[PDB]
Design a protein around this ligand. Structure first.
Ligand code: CLA
Ligand code: CLA
Ligand code: CLA
Ligand code: CLA
Ligand code: CLA
Ligand code: CLA
Ligand code: CLA
Ligand code: CLA
Ligand SMILES: CC1=C(/C=C/C(C)=C/C=C/C(C)=C/C=C/C=C(C)/C=C/C=C(C)/C=C/C2=C(C)CCCC2(C)C)C(C)(C)CCC1
Ligand SMILES: CC1=C(C/C=C(\C)CCC[C@H](C)CCC[C@H](C)CCCC(C)C)C(=O)c2ccccc2C1=O
Ligand SMILES: CCCCCCCCCCCCCCCCCC=O
Ligand code: SF4
Ligand code: SF4
Ligand code: SF4
Ligand SMILES: [Ca+2]
Lengths: 74, 74, 80, 162, 733, 64, 74, 143
């Protein structure tokens, strides 16, 4: 679980994103180096900062992921 | 049997032909849900005049790598 | 150590003496069953408490009981 | 108009919500051709939404302060007004539940009167189960007639430690 | 042979670490100590009681001292709405530059922490107004604590130790506890309310230097000895009346006004005096019921023997119950814990609805912390009551003494009782979970109208029967022609109706379809915890899988892996399993309370009412939305006052996760691991010089369950306390 | 001769047995003066797995 | 991690294991990344470039989105 | 047996490489056990402390730290090679104690030469309750 968490956050904060004429902008704010040193950084900038899509997923096309999210917790 | 099922689903219930002409704008999809209790919302608009469950298996990219144009080959 | 007891509802099948892995129980002669033998436990200080005798007991309820108590170096199974 | 609620026929929140859903579904109609399969699917979903709102309303169902229909469950309070249908008809579940219980109890008693009733549990006796399933339509009559005769319980033949 | 477990030679002769751990576990089980008689047992209990009283008074004395030294009590009295209470000062050499700058709040010169105990409002309400009165009262409480400690030692001496019959005397104990401890103390409290609390609330300073020269009422006892008792309720305090000065004050003392105070939002101080006075008269007149050494009174044994219905409804009735209760200590302990655990919850339910302290409804963190604290305390005490009932059934229940009575009669159908509890729990669980999942799926398919919403027509009917005219039920106390409305129409009904009709306080909050499901969830948790505890108490002395369980004690590991396996078969194990359900039930009731008040305090009462039906709405609008400021205590851009709460919020998570280790992993794996470490330390150079005095061994099975439960409960408590105080303190006052 | 008829179903009266108030078939009754000579056999197995046990003469009652 | 948590909570961000404060750099992996990047010039002459763009310096992007960008280690 | 065979030294111990699980500081400070048996041929057995060892012909003697290890090796030799072993308990001072078989026949036989101990002539379930044995230090089963 820690291995896949490290992969997802590192890719989203240092590789993936979109390139424009004035540089490349990552998916997140590029906060892998300044927020991974603390445990509160993970719980705040990874699990809480992300998962907002899973949380606000009701009524959308990916509505089954919120149901799968709550169901998996049970 | 599972591999044949994935090929048959990509042949009949997918949008591989639409994704083949626009791989950078249409999202992959190879599963359509029947409208029983609600459930129309899951059939998300994936683009290309088709609506279904967006798949993340990479079967379309694999079918692109070894030449496969129509659905008759699938 | 632990306290082992053998009640009179014993049938003398000699299964607890075979299941004991520390040579605690024995079979003494008796005159109250068909086999004319009843179990006993002279080496109670060597009881470890694995309760294999209770699983080997076939009568209902068990004729042998292992009541756990104080622990010593022998009853704790320590090899150091 | 009881418990401080109001009929779904005269609530602004009910109509506001109806228009909200009809609008979010209509926003997806512009992304497709006016005569294809996604267009037909979206049109069918819109018709079902309009029918459901009409069906949910004008049927005595009432909502409260948010347009969501509320349900009255007290008998008497649901009988003095036209609200008996929403939840007081518990007899449907009671009928199906008693049907299941009577069929299972009849299969357990009849199968026990046979040598070794165990393998009859892992390997069902399908002609006996199908016959017992279609014979329990009048289950409350059999339950009241099996209670007065004392053939429903046991006196004192139970594995107890009390 | 060591000498640390002085009370047990068996553990004293243990050559392992098990002697140390167990030496701290059975230290209070006086009933199973080496060479202990009934008289010695009762005398030891009488001493430990005094020790507990001494530490309680010392703790409250220390609280008064700390608030008088660092708290801004004098600054809080002049402005009880804007300023925040101060608990104590913070001295930490580990603090940095920004921690010292950010921890200074409440108008202080150094770093301090705001108090959530709510003692400032309590002291300001009872009459304490200076920073010196807390000082002198703190030294007085320390003095009375010292006296209790001396009294406990005094009674542990020859020619001063009480006998066994003195302990086994219920008539005089009940007479003195109902007359002196419950009645005289209440009479003294209403005397303080009428002599100090009432004049201090009207600006008239009354202290030890002038209370003998200021009369509480103008009439001055003249009506108490005359047929004019209503003179003490002539002019009550008007609406436009400040709680600090005499602007709009009155001269009445024993009034009867329903509702609250217009400025402090608390009950009238001239009503609590009347309340405590009526309670004092009732308790004093009730304390002369039993027969002491006189020619009047009642006999408890005679009442119990006379209470037996004819036609064999209960068989022997209550015959032998007097000797069963008086001869046993766990029965009395279970009854006392049940009563205390019930009234603790009663205190929690009445303090939030009817605030008794001035400016308590304004303090939002104090109310939440006080409610959560009292509810968790009540849950733990309620679990202890059933635990001691199981201990009673195993240790001191002789079946030959009370044959055929109600105690032996309820034991005959324990299977019926346990089975019906199982049915109720299964019903509530299946249906509450099904309704929640149905509303959740229907809400997830983009259709909220489809979700099932049940209006609580029974609790709404009760609220309409008590005065709330929002639902529309034309019933008594809400009508104008009912006999209950005309009765009391001139006594307390206008103030009570004015307080219950307002939608801003917490007195009888407006319920809806979202409270129905949560109330059913609360019912499910209560019936399940009761099922586990009642089953562990009734099946404590035997079962069909193990009939001689009563001969094995109360807390044993198992009875081997035979007969299918007997893991967690003792009553201790049953209580252990019930602690988790108690924690879950209290967590559900506190989540409900905090969310309803969290949505009422911010004027967004329509948020919870429409978003509390589905569990995703609970997880999003309650756990995810209210946790935005808590986790932002310390980020790479600095820190703030909430950082300490943010730290303990994660500290609780770590304690919880460590408890899961002792709960999942069992002793045998760890025993082999410890053996390998022993070989390592013995065959290693330069470290083999030292050696352990006691052989290292793994924790026992029962000990592992206890440590895991302690880690689980500590994490569960610390995490929620951090989130509650941070989420409330972070966005409110 | 002293015990019940061999092959007759009886009821167990031992209050601490797994077959209390149950019905078991008597397989044999010993005639040597032992404490528990009536040996019975039950259709349902106990928690240990056995299906037969021997009871005394006083803890054996006729079925219903 | 717990030390960085306590150092950030106590208001002392200069005493934590981070890139700004007291650091720990993975010099072995940084050297291997450099070796793989400059490897097709001396120890792989027939190879056109590095076997991957994980340690390179040329970010590739298809459709505006980043495909494989160089990865840095801290 | 007919006489307690006194344990004697200078017995050929089995060939075995150095193991790791055995004879710690307790085997010297407190006590340890020793098992002797007679082998009729040359075989390879499994020690209850690690790998496998061979069986030297003639007498055989092994030393262990726990009685359970000697009992485990005893049952292994009795059920896999049909032998008749016997073990002793050596105390710290050097006092040898015969341990198995004490009567010398086997512990699962009768032999009519041993008196029963720790037996209750009552059946389990007829024991009195915890309340009756209060402050008596004794227990229902002990009574
Ligand atoms: C008008 C005739 C009358 C009636 C109706 C009663 C009625 C009663 N008498 Mg009384 N009595 C009468 C005449 C009468 N008496 C006369 C003429 C005399 C002689 C003077 C007495 C003398 C007498 C004595 C001395 C006593 C009674 C008692 C009682 C009460 C209990 C009787 C009983 O068997 O318990 C009920 C039978 C049971 C089997 C109890 C059932 C328990 C249930 C099933 C538990 C279910 C709980 C479950 C969790 C519920 C869920 C609800 C949820 C909210 C939790 C009962 C209400 C006894 C009493 O005072 O008790 C209060 C008592 O000791 N009577
Ligand atoms: C890993 C294998 C796999 C999996 C997981 C699925 C899964 C699915 N398939 Mg698929 N399929 C597979 C292999 C697989 N298929 C293969 C190998 C073939 C080629 C033979 C097909 C051919 C196929 C077709 C033609 C269709 C599906 C459809 C479906 C979807 C629901 C239908 C269903 O099964 O309802 C439950 C099935 C039953 C209760 C009984 C099966 C039907 C019996 C055999 C005949 C019924 C007679 C009928 C009334 C006339 C579902 C998500 C349907 C779909 O996509 O929906 C839009 C659809 O029409 N599949
Ligand atoms: C334990 C379940 C339960 C509960 C909590 C209630 C509660 C209530 N019922 Mg009720 N009822 C129930 C079961 C229940 N009922 C059942 C099983 C039936 C038979 C089907 C009825 C039939 C019934 C009728 C006919 C009436 C009520 C009415 C009422 C309301 C006023 C009661 C009253 O006495 O008037 C006031 C009390 C003053 C002291 C009240 C909220 C009354 C109502 O609906 O209000 C208009 C009414 O007349 N009930
Ligand atoms: C048809 C068989 C049958 C019948 C008549 C009953 C009847 C009863 N059960 Mg029960 N039960 C059953 C099967 C059955 N059960 C099975 C298979 C299980 C294991 C999952 C349980 C587990 C169970 C528990 C844990 C409890 C009960 C309880 C009860 C009593 C309360 C009412 C209730 O509905 O509880 C609920 C019943 C269930 C949740 C079981 C539902 C599962 C289905 C209906 C069983 C499938 C039966 C099968 C289709 C029959 C075969 C048909 C045949 C033609 C082949 C009641 C007398 C409660 C009690 O103690 O008494 C007060 C209780 O706590 N039951
Ligand atoms: C009238 C004489 C008298 C008085 C005043 C007392 C007083 C006391 N006895 Mg005693 N006793 C007496 C006679 C008396 N006894 C006699 C004559 C006998 C012999 C027959 C005994 C035998 C006896 C024994 C054996 C024991 C006591 C004990 C105690 C102490 C009880 C513990 C306690 O403080 O709880 C305080 C109780 C209250 C304050 C009232 C109850 C509180 C309820 C729950 C309501 C809460 C009030 C309110 C809501 C909260 C407001 C506070 C909040 C604002 C902070 C107490 C100080 C126990 C002891 O040793 O000390 C612990 C004990 O073991 N007594
Ligand atoms: C333990 C509670 C308590 C105590 C210790 C006191 C003590 C005192 N009160 Mg008092 N008071 C109390 C409760 C208490 N009160 C309550 C509950 C009320 C409300 C009815 C009052 C109302 C009251 C008034 C109106 C007055 C006092 C006064 C006094 C002082 C003189 C009383 C006197 O000697 O009259 C005589 C005492 C007796 C005749 C013996 C007592 C009667 C027995 C116990 C019955 C005195 C120091 C008087 C005073 O001096 O003002 C400061 C005064 O005017 N009290
Ligand atoms: C009026 C209150 C009261 C009293 C007088 C007793 C008295 C007794 N209890 Mg009891 N009990 C109570 C309430 C009470 N209990 C409650 C509320 C519960 C529910 C939690 C229990 C549950 C309970 C059980 C399950 C058992 C007893 C047992 C006993 C008996 C001996 C064990 C003992 O006390 O040694 C002292 C025990 C200890 C010193 C252990 C202390 C470790 C605590 C629990 C952990 C502290 C948490 C943590 C470290 C806090 C630090 C946080 C950190 C961040 C700083 C004894 C007669 C035992 C018994 O009957 O004997 C077999 C038994 O097994 N009690
Ligand atoms: C135990 C909790 C629970 C309950 C009470 C409900 C209840 C309901 N759900 Mg729900 N649901 C649940 C759990 C639950 N659900 C869970 C856990 C999930 C997630 C898997 C869902 C997911 C879900 C979805 C997706 C939907 C529902 C829907 C519904 C509604 C369907 C009504 C219906 O089935 O038509 C009628 C069914 C019948 C008539 C069955 C016929 C049975 C026989 C043939 C007839 C009975 C005999 C008859 C009455 C004659 C008897 C005579 C008598 C008078 C004597 C209903 C109010 C649907 C809805 O419309 O929402 C409102 C729907 O969309 N549910
Ligand atoms: C195990 C056991 C035990 C314990 C037990 C317990 C724990 C119990 C409990 C319980 C509980 C915890 C209970 C509770 C209760 C309460 C109640 C039951 C109540 C009441 C009342 C009423 C009836 C009321 C009424 C009213 C009024 C008067 C006013 C207002 C209105 C109303 C209606 C509300 C012991 C030790 C003994 C031993 C035996 C066994
Ligand atoms: C790790 C582990 C051990 C080993 C744990 C040990 C040996 C604990 C001792 C390690 C140190 C000494 C603990 C530190 C002690 C505390 C910090 C303070 C305790 C002091 C209080 C009594 C005041 C077990 O013995 C065990 C037993 C049964 C199930 C699971 C487990 C288990 O998981
Ligand atoms: C599982 C038993 C059947 C196995 C053989 C399946 C034969 C299927 C052959 C392909 C059938 C395709 C039919 C598609 C019809 C619609 C064409 C439009 O795309
Ligand atoms: S518990 Fe184990 S060591 Fe003790 S007598 Fe039974 S089998 Fe032997
Ligand atoms: S196993 Fe039980 S019945 Fe058999 S000899 Fe041992 S104690 Fe007796
Ligand atoms: S608690 Fe441990 S020893 Fe006891 S039965 Fe369970 S697994 Fe076996
Ligand atoms: Ca003052």
């Amino acid at each position: 679980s820690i291995v896949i968490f490290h992969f997802s956050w590192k890719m989203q904060s240092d590789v993936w994103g979109t390139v424009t004429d004035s540089g490349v902008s990552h998916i997140t704010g590029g906060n892998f180096a300044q927020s991974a040193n603390t445990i509160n950084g993970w719980l705040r900038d990874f699990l809480w900062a992300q998962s907002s899509q899973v949380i606000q997923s009701y009524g959308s096309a990916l509505s089954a992921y919120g149901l799968m999210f709550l169901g998996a917790h049970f | 049997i599972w591999l044949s099922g994935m090929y048959f689903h990509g042949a009949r219930f997918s949008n591989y032909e639409g994704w083949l002409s626009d791989p950078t704008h249409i999202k992959p999809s190879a599963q359509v849900v029947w409208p029983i209790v609600g459930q129309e919302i899951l059939n998300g608009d994936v683009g290309g005049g088709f609506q279904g469950i967006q798949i993340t298996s990479g079967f379309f990219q694999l079918w692109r790598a070894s030449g496969i144009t129509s659905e008759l080959q699938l | 150590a632990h306290v082992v007891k053998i009640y009179d509802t014993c049938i003398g099948c000699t299964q607890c003496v075979r299941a004991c892995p520390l040579d605690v129980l024995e079979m003494v002669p008796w005159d109250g069953c068909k086999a004319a033998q009843m179990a006993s436990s002279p080496r109670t200080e060597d009881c470890v408490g694995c309760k294999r005798c209770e699983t080997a007991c076939p009568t209902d309820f068990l004729s042998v009981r292992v009541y756990l108590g104080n622990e010593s170096t022998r009853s704790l199974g320590l090899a150091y | 108009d009881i418990a401080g609620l109001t009929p779904c026929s005269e609530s602004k929140a009910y109509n506001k919500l109806e228009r909200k859903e009809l609008k979010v579904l209509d926003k997806r109609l512009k992304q497709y051709e006016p005569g294809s399969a996604p267009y037909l699917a979206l049109q069918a979903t819109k018709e079902r939404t309009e029918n459901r709102f009409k069906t949910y309303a004008k049927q005595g169902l009432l909502c409260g302060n948010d347009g969501l229909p509320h349900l009255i469950s007290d008998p008497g309070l649901a009988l003095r007004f036209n609200h008996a249908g929403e939840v007081f008809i518990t007899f449907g579940f009671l009928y199906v539940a008693g049907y299941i219980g009577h069929v299972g109890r009849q299969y357990i008693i009849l199968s026990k009167e046979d040598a070794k009733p165990t393998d009859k549990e892992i390997i069902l006796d399908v002609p006996l189960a199908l016959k017992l399933a279609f014979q329990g339509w009048a289950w409350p009559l059999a339950s009241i007639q099996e209670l007065r005769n004392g053939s429903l319980l046991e006196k004192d033949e139970n594995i107890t430690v009390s | 042979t060591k000498l640390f477990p002085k009370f047990s030679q068996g553990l004293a002769q243990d050559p392992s670490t098990r002697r140390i751990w167990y030496g701290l576990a059975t230290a209070h089980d006086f009933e199973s100590h080496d060479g202990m008689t009934e008289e010695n047992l009762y005398q030891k209990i009488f001493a430990s009681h005094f020790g507990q009283l001494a530490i309680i008074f010392l703790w409250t004395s220390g609280n008064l001292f700390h608030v008088a030294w660092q708290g801004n009590f004098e600054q809080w009295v002049t402005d009880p709405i804007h300023v925040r209470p101060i608990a104590h000062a913070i001295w930490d050499p580990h603090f940095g530059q920004p921690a010292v700058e950010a921890f200074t709040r409440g108008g202080a010169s150094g770093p301090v922490n705001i108090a959530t105990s709510g003692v400032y409002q309590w002291w300001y309400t009872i009459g304490l107004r200076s920073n010196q009165e807390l000082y002198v009262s703190s030294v007085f409480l320390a003095l009375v604590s010292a006296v209790f400690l001396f009294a406990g030692w005094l009674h542990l001496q020859p020619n001063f130790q009480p006998s066994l019959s003195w302990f086994k005397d219920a008539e005089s104990r009940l007479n003195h506890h109902l007359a002196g401890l419950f009645g005289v103390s209440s009479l003294a409290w209403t005397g303080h309310l009428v002599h100090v609390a009432i004049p201090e609330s009207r600006g008239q300073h009354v202290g030890w230097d002038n209370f003998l020269s200021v009369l509480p009422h103008p009439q001055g006892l003249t009506p108490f000895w005359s047929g004019n008792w209503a003179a003490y309720a002539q002019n009550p305090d008007t609406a436009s009346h400040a709680f600090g000065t005499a602007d709009g004050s009155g001269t009445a003392i024993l009034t009867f006004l329903g509702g609250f105070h217009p400025q402090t939002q608390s009950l009238w101080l001239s009503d609590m005096a009347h309340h405590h006075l009526a309670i004092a008269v009732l308790f004093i007149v009730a304390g002369h019921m039993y027969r002491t050494n006189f020619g009047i009174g009642h006999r408890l044994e005679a009442i119990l023997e006379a209470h037996t219905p004819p036609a064999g409804g209960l068989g022997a009735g209550h015959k032998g119950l007097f000797h069963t209760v008086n001869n046993s200590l766990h029965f009395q302990l279970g009854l006392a814990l049940a009563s205390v655990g019930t009234i603790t919850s009663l205190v929690a339910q009445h303090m939030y609805s009817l605030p008794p302290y001035a400016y308590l409804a304004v303090d939002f963190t104090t109310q939440a912390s006080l409610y959560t604290h009292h509810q968790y305390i009540a849950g733990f005490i309620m679990c202890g009551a059933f635990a001691h009932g199981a201990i009673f059934f195993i240790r001191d229940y002789d079946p030959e003494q009370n044959k055929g009575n109600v105690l032996a009669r309820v034991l005959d159908h324990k299977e019926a009782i346990i089975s019906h509890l199982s049915w109720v729990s299964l019903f509530l669980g299946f249906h509450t979970l099904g309704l929640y999942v149905h509303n959740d799926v229907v809400q997830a398919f983009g259709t909220p109208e489809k979700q099932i919403l049940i209006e609580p027509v029974f609790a709404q009917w009760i609220q309409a029967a008590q005065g709330k005219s929002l639902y529309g039920f034309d019933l008594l106390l809400a009508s104008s022609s009912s006999p209950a409305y005309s009765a009391g129409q001139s006594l307390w009904l206008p103030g009570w109706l004015e307080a219950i009709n307002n939608n801003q306080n917490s007195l009888f909050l407006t319920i809806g379809p979202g409270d129905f499901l949560v109330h059913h969830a609360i019912a499910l948790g209560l019936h399940t915890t009761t099922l586990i505890l009642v089953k562990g108490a009734l099946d404590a002395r035997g079962s069909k899988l193990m009939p001689d369980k009563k001969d094995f004690g109360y807390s044993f590991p198992c009875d081997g892996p035979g007969r299918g396996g007997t893991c967690d078969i003792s009553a201790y194990d049953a209580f252990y399993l019930a602690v988790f359900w108690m924690l879950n039930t209290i967590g559900w009731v506190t989540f409900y309370w905090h969310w309803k008040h969290l949505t009422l305090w911010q004027g967004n009462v329509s948020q919870f009412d429409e978003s509390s039906t589905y569990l995703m709405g609970w997880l999003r609008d309650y756990l995810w939305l209210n946790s935005s400021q808590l986790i932002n205590g310390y980020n790479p851009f600095g820190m703030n006052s909430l950082s300490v709460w943010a730290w303990t919020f994660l500290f609780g998570h770590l304690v919880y996760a460590t408890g899961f280790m002792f709960l999942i992993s069992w002793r045998g794996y760890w025993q082999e691991l410890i053996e390998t470490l022993v070989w390592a330390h013995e065959k290693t150079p330069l470290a083999n010089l030292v050696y352990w005095k006691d052989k290292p061994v793994a924790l026992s099975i029962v000990q592992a369950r206890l440590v895991g439960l302690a880690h689980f409960s500590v994490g569960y408590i610390f995490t929620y306390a951090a989130f509650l105080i941070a989420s409330t303190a972070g966005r409110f006052g | 001769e002293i015990g019940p008829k061999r092959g007759s179903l009886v009821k167990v009266l031992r209050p601490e047995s797994y077959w209390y108030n149950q019905v078991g078939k008597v397989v044999s009754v010993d005639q040597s003066g032992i404490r528990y000579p009536v040996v019975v056999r039950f259709e349902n197995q106990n928690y240990a797995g056995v299906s037969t046990n021997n009871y005394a003469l006083d803890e054996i009652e006729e079925v219903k | 991690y717990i030390h960085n948590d306590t150092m950030s909570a106590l208001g002392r961000p200069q005493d934590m294991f981070s890139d700004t404060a007291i650091q720990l750099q993975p010099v072995f992996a940084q050297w291997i990344q450099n070796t793989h990047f400059t490897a097709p010039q001396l120890t792989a002459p027939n190879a056109l470039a590095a076997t991957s763009l994980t340690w390179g310096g040329d970010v590739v992007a298809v459709g505006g989105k980043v495909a494989m960008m160089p990865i840095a280690l801290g | 047996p007919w006489k307690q065979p006194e344990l004697d030294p200078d017995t050929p111990s089995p060939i075995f490489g150095g193991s790791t699980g055995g004879l710690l500081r307790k085997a010297q400070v407190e006590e340890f056990y020793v098992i002797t048996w007679e082998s009729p041929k040359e075989q390879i057995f499994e020690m209850p402390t690690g790998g496998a060892a061979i069986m030297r012909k003639g007498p055989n003697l092994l030393k262990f730290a726990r009685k359970e290890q000697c009992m485990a090796l005893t049952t292994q030799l009795r059920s896999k090679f049909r032998q008749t072993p016997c073990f002793y308990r050596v105390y710290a001072d050097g006092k040898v104690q015969y341990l198995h078989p004490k009567d010398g026949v086997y512990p699962e036989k009768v032999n009519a030469g041993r008196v029963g101990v720790n037996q209750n002539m009552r059946s389990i379930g007829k024991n009195v309750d915890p309340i009756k044995v209060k402050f008596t230090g004794s227990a229902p089963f002990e009574i």
